[PDB]
């Protein structure tokens, strides 16, 4: 969506509303403001920002990085906007295929029985807490971990 100044070109990334729809969502003032915004990366995860978000000129290629088992938003604090501005605001993260690695074989552990024996869910609850996130859910059969943050 060139017209809104939004920069998102990486393969596998998408927005909700779609980049094509955001292209048709520029108001009389040159601005693209949506109510509820998701940026996702298929196979990896998504980040949902509730409420009114001004997307104008957002350089999502530089700002948002959804990787295996982690998200990075604003990689440089010198370029991070104040609390409540841009994407530095409350968000709900969904990460896909969040599974432990076998200590000797380095293989992914997906069996729900082994996951429950390690209490992997409790590992994710503790990891959410130690990072200041609010644990929401873990689905073992898909490895989907959901948690919420106040900002980035």
């Amino acid at each position, epitope marked *: 969506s060139h017209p809104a100044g939004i920069i998102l070109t990486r393969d596998s990334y998408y927005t909700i509303p779609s980049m094509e729809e955001l292209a048709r969502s520029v108001d009389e003032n040159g601005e693209c403001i949506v109510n509820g915004f998701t940026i996702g990366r298929e196979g990896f995860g998504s980040i949902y920002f509730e409420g009114i978000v001004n997307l104008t000129n957002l350089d999502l290629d530089s700002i948002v990085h959804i990787r295996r088992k982690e998200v990075i938003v604003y990689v440089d604090d010198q370029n991070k906007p104040p609390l409540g501005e841009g994407l530095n605001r409350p968000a709900q993260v969904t990460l896909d295929e969040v599974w432990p690695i076998d*200590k000797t074989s380095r293989c992914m552990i997906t069996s729900p029985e082994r996951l429950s024996e390690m209490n992997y869910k409790s590992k994710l609850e503790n*990891a959410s807490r130690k990072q200041g996130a609010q644990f929401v859910d873990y689905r073992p059969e898909s490895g989907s971990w959901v948690f919420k943050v106040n900002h980035f």
Partner: nanobody
Amino acid sequence: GQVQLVESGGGLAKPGGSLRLSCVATGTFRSMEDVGWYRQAPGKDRELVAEITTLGKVTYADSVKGRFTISRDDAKNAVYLQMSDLKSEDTAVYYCNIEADQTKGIGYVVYPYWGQGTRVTVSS
């Protein structure tokens, strides 16, 4: 990310003796998660000796329970095995396994790392 392990404390003791194994992790990681000591003798599979998960659960192999004591220091990122009442079957190379949290943003990226090990010989 990078992790380097330095294992030490292995040497020779006779039956009934004592040693202290140590492993120190450095590198770029956020924290140590599950940590454990293992051992491999010739002709055998590598076996778990003792472990402390990131949640605090402790586990000993039946053959060393009450003789070996694992502990961890999460300020210094080090893992120790106090081996007392050593028996000749304890002879093996000992390996510390350290799970490193390598997350860069928010998440739970964890990979396990092995060292080159430290040799224990319990001789007659």
